[PDB]
Amino acid sequence: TANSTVKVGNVTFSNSAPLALIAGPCQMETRDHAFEMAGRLKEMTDKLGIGLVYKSSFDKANIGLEKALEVFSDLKKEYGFPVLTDIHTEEQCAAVAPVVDVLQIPAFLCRQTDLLIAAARTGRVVNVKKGQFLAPWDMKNVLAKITESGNPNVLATERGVSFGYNTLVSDMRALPIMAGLGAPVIFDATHSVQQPGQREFVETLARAAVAVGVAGFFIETHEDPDNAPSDGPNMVPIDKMPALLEKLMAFDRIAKAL
Amino acid sequence: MVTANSTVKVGNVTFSNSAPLALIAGPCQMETRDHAFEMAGRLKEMTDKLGIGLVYKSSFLEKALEVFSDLKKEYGFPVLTDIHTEEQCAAVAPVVDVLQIPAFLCRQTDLLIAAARTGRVVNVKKGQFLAPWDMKNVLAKITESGNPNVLATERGVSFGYNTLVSDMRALPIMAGLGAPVIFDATHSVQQPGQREFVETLARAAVAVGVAGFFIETHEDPDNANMVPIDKMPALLEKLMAFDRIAKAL
Amino acid sequence: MVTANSTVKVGNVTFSNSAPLALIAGPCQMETRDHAFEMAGRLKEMTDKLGIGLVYKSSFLEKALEVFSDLKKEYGFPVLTDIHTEEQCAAVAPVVDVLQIPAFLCRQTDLLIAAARTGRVVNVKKGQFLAPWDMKNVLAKITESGNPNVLATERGVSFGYNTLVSDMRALPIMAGLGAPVIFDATHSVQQPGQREFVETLARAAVAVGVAGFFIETHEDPDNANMVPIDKMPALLEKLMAFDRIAKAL
Amino acid sequence: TANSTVKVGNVTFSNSAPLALIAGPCQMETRDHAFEMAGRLKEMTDKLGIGLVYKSSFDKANIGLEKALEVFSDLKKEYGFPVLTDIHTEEQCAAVAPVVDVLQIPAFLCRQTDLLIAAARTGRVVNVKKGQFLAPWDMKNVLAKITESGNPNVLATERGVSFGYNTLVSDMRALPIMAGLGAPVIFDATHSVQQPGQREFVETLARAAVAVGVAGFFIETHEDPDNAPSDGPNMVPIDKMPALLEKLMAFDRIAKAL
């Protein structure tokens, strides 16, 4: 019993609506860097008519919460977008909820029922990253922990499944399956390509997903991914983002008429 | 020496990962002569309206080759059928434009060589036990035999038990081998040992970029897996809209 | 610098891929104090007769640590429990001999470091998303933190959907990393999202060669997955017979 | 409705009986080479009390039938063992059946119903290699094509399943599952380790399988596997075979009492 349209600040997520973007660097760095990344993402999405949710993690985990919340607060004041971050404990959900619009359950924690309930109880939008060890239908039971806990605003993010050793595959059937559960479906293009333990296939997977039909994309991006503090091999260079997004929007226009 | 053609011309059809999508379509098995002309006429009608190339396919031999020959006289399209032995390649080659290597036989060198030596276009279905880069050495058996006209068909890869998965990365990787890549929508959804997901996989594949689509279709697929023929015009129209974008990028 | 110990001594138990098998066993969750002493007594009885080391395990904290402490006073064995946060490591360490990292947390560096810094033995369950060689970098987070006493537990790897598979090659590969390898028979048969195959997988693992077996067990597993406790003596006797051969070769 | 004991010449296959060995080089080479391999295999199995079925292929396929049948006939005359070879067409089953005791259906052909029926109709023992794309329970339907065709003497050979790309895994649960179908189960140690498109793990997998319980082993072997005409990376050096087999028999003695 999820909301099929999830509205967060100025952003609408729905399998029927134009694509929305969750984007940002993996890890929050300096305040300088945060404002540069968020400014560039806001400009390119403003021009395209794409809603933006700005993302960054503060726990490292495989800047710290206090500092990060200050930066997130100032970003929101300057740019007006909702923000997202990942949470790892019940105490972290309560601590970030005053500022952060969308709480994210990491893939490794997607089965941790008490964390799903704690996120749910904040009344924030909850994005659940589907674990690479889950099947698409398994998400019914995961998302239910949130919706049956009284929070109807859930997003389900596809991020690939384990395929042998050191390989993920993206089963495009996950998208209609999860959409059938009633929550907006988000496609994580950057983690879906990774070699557990690849950037050349981000566009490939993104094009496939948008044509199938998704509410949104989750794309990690950075100005110099090879030199980034975390997750660097996977992130799209920020200067390549406008071209990617323009392409995705062309397909989305067709996909969302059918 | 000899290398795969990135553009493969078959009769009045052009396959290339840079050209508009062409269609390989038909029933699994040839039934009757009348059934063949019906399916083919319906397929040609829809492909004529959309402006897409059609290769008509069926699996069978004497009677079948006469049916194929007559279909070609009447409709002017090329045809495709599966071959299983060296002897079969030789028998069907005077009539059939595309010889198809089934996925279970994609590593059978002697068959690959026989089909190559006929001079026909050879379509190899990628085994569900192969990785996309494994098609390099498969395609090389045809091209090193002197035949540059090869098509590589994606049809899914084994994913745990009784499950296939469509890794869309297979498409650019195989395209990189230098042959047109064909997406088999109807076998890629199979539950080994699902028709609902055929549109899903097809939309994904076309947005990634393919030379063509391979779809098994029938007027009554429950009494024949297959896309009902009455679902083809809507599906194809959607796939052509995505293709136009995919091929311009 | 610091490297994993190929022999890990825990209280009166020795773990090594060259030593006789030792047993890590107990219920999933600690129930009551009386239930704990019962399970433990039954396990110690059977391990005493067979001459095998026993580490008693349970998941929970204040009451639980008092139970563990009393079990140790009475039975003299080491104990193991799962930890989920840094704070938890610190709280359980004064009592619990082996800190266990659950499979879902095996990549959580901060937790790995916290458990390492306690000076206790750390057992890391291999994530079902990891390859066996991926345990190199996991184990290194504990050893580079100054703790050489690590156990590596095999518990299956994802195999398509809702299925795990036990790749017996994981065992020598992980042994090659230099830590004793533990086989989790009860989680390796899991259907994510099967008790019949626990003996099958255990027999295979022991013939390959493992430092130990991890088995969840209960007196009434339907009202608690788990091996019924009354099935343990027969299973263990079989596994010891294979172990003797495996360890001499 | 398979025979739970399959007797072929001097060899007994049963999940209850001491292990039997199917062994030989992948491809038949010279007559010299055939007699050397078969002699060495007969000597080492004679000493251990292990029944031997000598194997070689004549079709190449990813010496030729006429020559191979002559060699097989002379081997049988000299050594007295049953022999095995793989068949690929209905005509090949009829052509080799006069001489060959055990017809083998290759993994890639295990779903080809007409070939299963043709092998069955020869009245020879049929060994079916389980395809790497099959599940253990799928073998019920495969083996049924033989037994329902009137031939109750079938062997089911485990040879690994596809695990991501260029990797096989050996699911040891396949062994009790297939045994539950009633046919003797054979473990192919050499193909189960291979990298599709490894010898150091032949003993690992073999030890696992024998402890679980199997009727037999299928082991490809050659005097100089690195220089062999086919399948060389996978085959056990013939001089390592006695030590391997001695180890397997030690475990088998325990496994077959339980």
Coordinates of N, CA and C in Angstrom, one line a residue, chain B residues 84-85 104-105 107-111 128-134 157-162 167 169-170 190 192-193, chain D residues 59-62 88-89 108-109 111-112 132-138 161-166 171 173-174 196-197:
Chain B
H84 N 20.8 -28.6 -38.1 CA 21.3 -29.4 -37.0 C 22.5 -30.3 -37.4
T85 N 22.6 -30.6 -38.7 CA 23.7 -31.4 -39.2 C 24.4 -30.8 -40.5
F104 N 22.1 -24.6 -28.6 CA 22.8 -25.8 -28.1 C 23.9 -26.3 -29.0
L105 N 23.9 -25.9 -30.2 CA 25.0 -26.3 -31.2 C 26.0 -25.2 -31.5
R107 N 28.7 -24.2 -30.3 CA 30.1 -24.6 -30.2 C 30.5 -25.8 -31.2
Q108 N 29.6 -26.2 -32.0 CA 29.9 -27.4 -32.9 C 30.6 -27.0 -34.2
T109 N 31.9 -26.9 -34.1 CA 32.8 -26.4 -35.1 C 32.5 -26.9 -36.5
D110 N 32.3 -28.3 -36.6 CA 32.0 -28.9 -37.9 C 30.8 -28.3 -38.5
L111 N 29.7 -28.1 -37.7 CA 28.5 -27.5 -38.2 C 28.7 -26.1 -38.6
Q128 N 23.2 -20.4 -23.9 CA 22.9 -19.8 -22.7 C 24.1 -20.0 -21.6
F129 N 25.0 -20.9 -22.0 CA 26.2 -21.2 -21.3 C 27.4 -20.4 -21.7
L130 N 27.3 -19.5 -22.7 CA 28.4 -18.6 -23.2 C 28.3 -17.2 -22.6
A131 N 29.5 -16.6 -22.5 CA 29.6 -15.2 -22.2 C 29.6 -14.4 -23.5
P132 N 29.4 -13.1 -23.5 CA 29.2 -12.5 -24.8 C 30.5 -12.5 -25.6
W133 N 31.7 -12.3 -24.9 CA 33.0 -12.3 -25.5 C 33.4 -13.7 -26.1
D134 N 32.7 -14.8 -25.6 CA 32.9 -16.2 -26.1 C 32.5 -16.3 -27.6
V157 N 21.1 -15.9 -20.9 CA 22.1 -16.7 -20.3 C 21.6 -17.3 -19.0
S158 N 22.0 -18.5 -18.7 CA 21.6 -19.2 -17.5 C 21.8 -18.4 -16.2
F159 N 20.8 -18.4 -15.4 CA 20.9 -17.6 -14.1 C 20.3 -18.4 -13.0
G160 N 21.2 -19.0 -12.3 CA 20.7 -20.0 -11.3 C 20.0 -21.2 -12.0
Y161 N 18.9 -21.7 -11.4 CA 18.3 -22.8 -12.0 C 16.9 -22.4 -12.6
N162 N 16.7 -22.9 -13.7 CA 15.4 -22.8 -14.4 C 15.0 -21.3 -14.8
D167 N 21.4 -9.9 -20.1 CA 22.4 -8.9 -19.7 C 22.6 -8.0 -20.9
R169 N 24.4 -5.7 -21.5 CA 25.8 -5.5 -21.8 C 26.3 -6.4 -23.0
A170 N 25.7 -7.6 -23.1 CA 26.0 -8.5 -24.2 C 25.9 -7.8 -25.5
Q190 N 12.3 -17.2 -21.6 CA 12.0 -18.6 -21.3 C 12.3 -18.9 -19.8
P192 N 13.6 -22.2 -18.4 CA 14.0 -23.5 -18.8 C 13.6 -24.6 -17.9
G193 N 13.1 -25.7 -18.4 CA 12.6 -26.9 -17.6 C 11.3 -26.6 -16.9
Chain D
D59 N 34.6 -38.5 -32.4 CA 34.1 -37.3 -33.0 C 34.6 -36.1 -32.2
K60 N 35.1 -35.1 -32.9 CA 36.1 -34.2 -32.4 C 35.9 -33.2 -31.3
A61 N 34.7 -32.4 -31.3 CA 33.6 -32.4 -32.3 C 33.2 -30.9 -32.3
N62 N 33.2 -30.2 -31.2 CA 33.5 -28.8 -31.0 C 34.9 -28.6 -31.4
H88 N 26.4 -38.5 -31.2 CA 25.9 -37.2 -31.5 C 24.7 -37.2 -32.5
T89 N 24.5 -38.3 -33.2 CA 23.4 -38.5 -34.1 C 22.7 -39.9 -33.9
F108 N 25.7 -31.0 -24.2 CA 25.0 -30.1 -25.1 C 23.8 -30.8 -25.8
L109 N 23.8 -32.1 -25.8 CA 22.7 -32.8 -26.4 C 21.7 -33.4 -25.4
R111 N 19.1 -32.5 -24.0 CA 17.7 -32.2 -24.2 C 17.1 -32.7 -25.5
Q112 N 18.0 -33.4 -26.3 CA 17.6 -33.8 -27.7 C 16.9 -35.1 -27.6
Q132 N 25.0 -28.1 -18.5 CA 25.3 -27.1 -17.5 C 24.2 -26.1 -17.3
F133 N 23.2 -26.2 -18.2 CA 22.0 -25.3 -18.2 C 20.8 -26.0 -17.5
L134 N 21.0 -27.2 -17.0 CA 19.9 -27.9 -16.4 C 20.0 -27.8 -14.8
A135 N 18.9 -27.9 -14.2 CA 18.7 -28.2 -12.8 C 18.7 -29.7 -12.5
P136 N 19.1 -30.1 -11.2 CA 19.2 -31.5 -10.9 C 17.8 -32.2 -11.1
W137 N 16.7 -31.6 -10.8 CA 15.4 -32.2 -10.9 C 15.0 -32.3 -12.4
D138 N 15.5 -31.5 -13.3 CA 15.3 -31.6 -14.7 C 15.7 -32.9 -15.3
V161 N 27.3 -26.8 -13.2 CA 26.3 -25.9 -13.8 C 26.9 -24.5 -13.9
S162 N 26.4 -23.8 -14.9 CA 26.8 -22.4 -15.2 C 26.5 -21.5 -14.0
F163 N 27.6 -20.8 -13.6 CA 27.6 -19.9 -12.5 C 28.2 -18.5 -13.0
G164 N 27.4 -17.6 -13.5 CA 27.9 -16.4 -14.1 C 28.5 -16.7 -15.4
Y165 N 29.6 -15.9 -15.7 CA 30.3 -16.1 -17.0 C 31.6 -16.9 -16.8
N166 N 31.9 -17.8 -17.7 CA 33.2 -18.5 -17.7 C 33.5 -19.3 -16.5
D171 N 27.1 -28.1 -7.5 CA 26.1 -28.1 -6.4 C 26.0 -29.6 -6.0
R173 N 24.2 -30.9 -3.8 CA 22.8 -31.3 -3.7 C 22.3 -32.0 -5.0
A174 N 23.0 -31.8 -6.1 CA 22.6 -32.6 -7.3 C 22.8 -34.1 -7.1
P196 N 34.6 -22.5 -18.6 CA 34.0 -22.5 -19.9 C 34.5 -21.3 -20.7
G197 N 35.1 -21.5 -21.9 CA 35.7 -20.5 -22.7 C 37.0 -19.9 -22.1

